[PDB]
Amino acid sequence: MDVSFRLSGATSSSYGVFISNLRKALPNERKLYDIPLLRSSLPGSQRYALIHLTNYADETISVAIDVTNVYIMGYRAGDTSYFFNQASATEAAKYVFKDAMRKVTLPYSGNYERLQTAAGKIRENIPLGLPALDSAITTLFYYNANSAASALMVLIQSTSEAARYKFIEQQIGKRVDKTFLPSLAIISLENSWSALSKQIQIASTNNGQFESPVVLINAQNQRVTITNVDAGVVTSNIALLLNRNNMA
Numbered sequence: 001m002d003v004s005f006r007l008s009g010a011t012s013s014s015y016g017v018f019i020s021n022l023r024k025a026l027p028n029e030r031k032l033y034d035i036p037l038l039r040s041s042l043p044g045s046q047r048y049a050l051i052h053l054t055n056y057a058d059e060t061i062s063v064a065i066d067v068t069n070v071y072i073m074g075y076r077a078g079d080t081s082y083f084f085n086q087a088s089a090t091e092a093a094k095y096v097f098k099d100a101m102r103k104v105t106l107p108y109s110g111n112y113e114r115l116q117t118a119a120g121k122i123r124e125n126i127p128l129g130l131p132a133l134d135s136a137i138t139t140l141f142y143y144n145a146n147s148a149a150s151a152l153m154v155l156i157q158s159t160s161e162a163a164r165y166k167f168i169e170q171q172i173g174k175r176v177d178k179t180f181l182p183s184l185a186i187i188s189l190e191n192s193w194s195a196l197s198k199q200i201q202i203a204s205t206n207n208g209q210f211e212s213p214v215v216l217i218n219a220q221n222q223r224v225t226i227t228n229v230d231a232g233v234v235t236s237n238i239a240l241l242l243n244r245n246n247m248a
């Protein structure tokens, strides 16, 4: 199931509609604490969703996402496809963007450590917000090795991370005509998705208590140790759970 988002005429609410549509497009059979639990394994024909993004200038790219972990596999710009250099993306290439004439394998996987090294910048210093997503679309449509890694981190955060956390969706969407640097709280949520997903599943079989705590960074940049499902991040923020059998 594919979804789209257009930057021209975009508003905070239209970005919210987009991210809600993206979450809905990801298959799920179960929910834990009313949070959809992503599937651990899906056949190729059900494993990918396409996100179609158009910038202010009416240029469009299509983004392939693995619905089991919301990872970006690659994207298409006109007649060229670009895929990350990672096992799951190589597999994705057999199913999506099959008709592109030229196929580029990027020099890195989509892991943040590789992307920040390639971009020569850490996530905290890369602007986010709707105008930043516009620029990332332009940058990737007119692909250049020098600028792609940074744009890909904007893209991943504006799609994958926003879908996983209401907080991230809300902070990016409120920047309609301005941009902002993400706080340590955002970095922490991104870093902690797998561990949180894991502990929330364990909690469902352990009276709501985590087996191991998860350390997050709050609004005051303080380390907070999360131990159960009544914590605010579980009750009102995390929006998708990575399946325990799909963590590595």
Ligand SMILES: Nc1ncnc2c1ncn2[C@H]1C[C@H](O)[C@@H](COP(=O)(O)O)O1
Pocket: 070, 071, 072, 073, 084, 109, 110, 111, 112, 113, 156, 160, 190, 191
């Ligand atoms: N392809 C793709 N899309 C989106 N986010 C990604 C991707 N590859 C890695 N990552 C991010 C997800 C986690 O913050 C970190 C761990 O990746 P790992 O390398 O799996 O341990 O890297």
